[PDB]
């Protein structure tokens, strides 16, 4: 993925402090794995995945939406089990806003309906024969100003001769203007082709002209202007003997400075082979045409974007059954391809258990788990939001992301303020026995908890823990995947001259022994491993016992005298 935002350039060393209603929010904690999310979200590039390490970046780029709330749940659900790093992509295919005034085509780095609230305009600076720019993004209150735009340096001819003329030629094939010739009294001193080579930069031209005993080229102090020579503007017969002759690169100066604006991009209008529409001052005018578009009917293309990213957990912020099928098919493809993943899903408000069974009937896959409960969460700024299940799914996903590989989410507490429905003991049993993960409520003397009763996937059979309990299957997944990638490097990747089946067997046993020494695996059979080699291919087979968690306790009391 792409970490979108690099540093802001700074100007002065200082410490500034400002009161506010809200702070920087959460932060991504250290994690073995990564958490992928997709949802409605304002800001950012559509069909592009962004990596987030802090809530500040999420605010700065994913400017608003339920997605940003989901990130808050991921890191705010539990400080101890804070969720790890994040990969995010907005479902909405937003559009940029555009303005085409004053010889300039102006477009928004922002995508969405917000983009139409951007205003940009040029102004004429009579003081130095120059153009002036102002950029205001009203929603973020971001104001920018540039002045003396285009004027690089001034030339004076000091001799007594009658006339000194400055000329610049134009190439119509490419629309460039790449010559600069100084003539005095119908005689020429030098000519500088601005097509690279001898005079690629204006710096050399200034040095060249200054060497001429009868001329002086002097640098304008208002803004760094060391532009390449090819960016100089069309100039025709300017009298050098006069008070001041300006050398101009209006777009070149704009091109450099405006690259640092945080809101805008600039293009030079070609007339509608058509010559250039002159860049001229114009009123500060709104950009237009920026919209959010519509979401696609199918999210398969979006999911395919996450292939080869390593995000074990993926959560779609939706309740659509078809979307769930798309993810399940996608996860199935990646798992066979060599990229294991798990999907967490939950739909609607207070949905009927029969409808939950309807989803279970339609969908029975160990790679996915279905959450049933819907509730409300208290979040930053004191606002409490009542939300569907797929937001609860994020809390489960954020929790599972923070937990270690060998530890299940089973029975762990949750911070959710309240739930729509309080399932009974029998109600909970029916869900769990049918492969539905739910939340349980308990009350202390003066405390209340919401707990995750157990780990269960949509797959119903209790025969095989790896199929049923995602925690067990996850432990197997990371074990094998980490092993194979290491094995690929040693033998396939690294140049190996020779190899035998027994050598592979020893390496495997060495790997497993290390895991036990790290407590990642409790026990295993050493003699069960099998290795077969056939030309350029090898087959490896082995078994490891899954970890077993503590589930049931039964107690009885007897009262007696004395």
């Amino acid at each position: 993925a792409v970490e979108p935002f690099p540093r802001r350039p700074i100007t002065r060393p200082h410490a500034s402090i400002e009161v506010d209603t809200s702070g920087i929010g959460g932060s991504a904690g250290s994690s073995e794995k990564v958490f992928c999310l997709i949802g409605q979200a304002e800001g950012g590039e559509p069909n592009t995945v962004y990596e987030l390490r802090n809530y500040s970046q999420a605010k700065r780029l994913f400017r608003s939406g339920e997605l940003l709330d989901a990130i808050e749940l991921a890191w705010g659900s539990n400080p101890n089990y804070t969720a790890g790093r994040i990969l995010a992509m907005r479902i909405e295919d937003a559009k940029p806003a555009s303005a085409e005034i004053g010889g300039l085509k102006i477009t928004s780095k922002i995508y969405g309906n917000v983009a139409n609230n951007i205003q940009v305009g040029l102004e004429k600076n009579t003081l130095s024969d120059s153009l002036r720019l102002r950029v205001i993004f009203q929603d973020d209150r971001f104001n920018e100003v540039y002045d003396n735009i285009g004027n690089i340096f001034t030339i004076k001819y000091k001799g007594e001769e009658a006339n000194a003329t400055f000329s610049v030629e134009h190439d119509e094939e490419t629309q460039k203007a790449s010559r600069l010739v100084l003539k005095v009294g119908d005689q020429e001193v030098k000519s500088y082709d601005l097509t690279g080579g001898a005079y690629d930069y204006t710096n050399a031209i200034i040095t060249d002209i200054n060497q001429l005993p009868d001329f002086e080229a002097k640098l304008s102090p208002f803004g760094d202007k060391n532009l390449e020579s090819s960016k100089l503007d069309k100039i025709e017969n300017a009298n050098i003997k006069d008070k001041a002759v300006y050398v101009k690169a209006v777009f070149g100066d704009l091109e450099k400075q405006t690259a640092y604006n945080g809101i805008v991009s600039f293009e030079q209008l070609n007339a509608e082979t058509s010559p250039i529409k002159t860049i001229e001052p114009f009123e500060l005018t709104k950009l237009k045409g920026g919209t959010n578009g519509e979401p696609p009917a199918t999210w398969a293309d979006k999911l395919d974007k996450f292939a080869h990213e390593g995000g074990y957990y993926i959560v779609p912020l939706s309740s659509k059954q078809s979307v769930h099928a798309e993810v399940a098919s996608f996860v199935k493809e990646r798992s066979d391809a060599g990229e294991p993943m798990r999907a967490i899903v939950g739909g609607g408000f207070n949905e009927s258990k029969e409808q939950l069974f309807g989803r279970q009937a339609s969908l029975s896959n160990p790679r996915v788990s279905l959450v049933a409960n819907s509730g409300t969460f208290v979040m930053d700024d004191g606002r409490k939001n009542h939300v569907p299940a797929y937001m609860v799914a994020v809390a489960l996903g954020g929790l599972a992301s923070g937990l270690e590989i060998g530890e299940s989410i089973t029975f762990k507490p949750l911070r959710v303020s309240s739930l729509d429905q309080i399932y009974e003991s029998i109600d909970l049993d029916e869900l769990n026995e049918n492969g539905i993960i739910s939340i349980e409520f308990v009350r202390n003397r003066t405390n209340t908890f919401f707990r995750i009763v157990d780990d269960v996937t949509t797959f119903n059979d209790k025969s095989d823990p790896v199929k049923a309990e995602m925690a067990v299957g996850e432990a197997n997944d990371f074990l094998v995947s980490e092993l194979k990638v290491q094995l690929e490097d040693q033998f396939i990747g690294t140049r190996t001259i020779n190899t035998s089946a027994s050598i592979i067997k020893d390496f495997i046993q060495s790997y497993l022994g290390r895991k036990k020494r790290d407590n990642e695996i409790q026990d295993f059979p050493a003699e069960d491993v099998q290795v077969i080699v056939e030309g350029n291919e090898a087959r490896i087979s082995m078994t490891v016992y899954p970890i077993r968690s503590f589930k049931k306790i039964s107690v009885s009391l007897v009262y007696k005298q004395q």
Partner: protein, 141 residues
Amino acid sequence: ASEAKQTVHTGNTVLLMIKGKPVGRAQSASGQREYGTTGVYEIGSIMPQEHVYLRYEGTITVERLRMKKENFADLGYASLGEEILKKDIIDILVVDNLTKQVIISYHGCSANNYNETWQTNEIVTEEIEFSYLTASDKART
């Protein structure tokens, strides 16, 4: 064996800092604490019914080889004469060398004892004892 994979803090992995500088030629550092724990006893039974905490005592020790420059006396972190009354509290941090993450911090350190030795063929050894107000281990998570 490797730098990152070793689960145990060797002396090499640790770095000691004071006031935005590392302490050169450090040799040892010890921190001791007493919660002033006591037992509750009554007439009914000999066994202590409960335990409670009374007073908090916290001290840290440091040893160093006297450099020709940047010693505690030279650096002002420690004082010999009456100038001590003009010295404020100091905060010490013990740091992970790899990432400059914090391992433990001592707040409000003030000096108790200062010892110095010279000998024919040994290296000059500088020792100092600090008493502090509190010790905290936060910002790790």
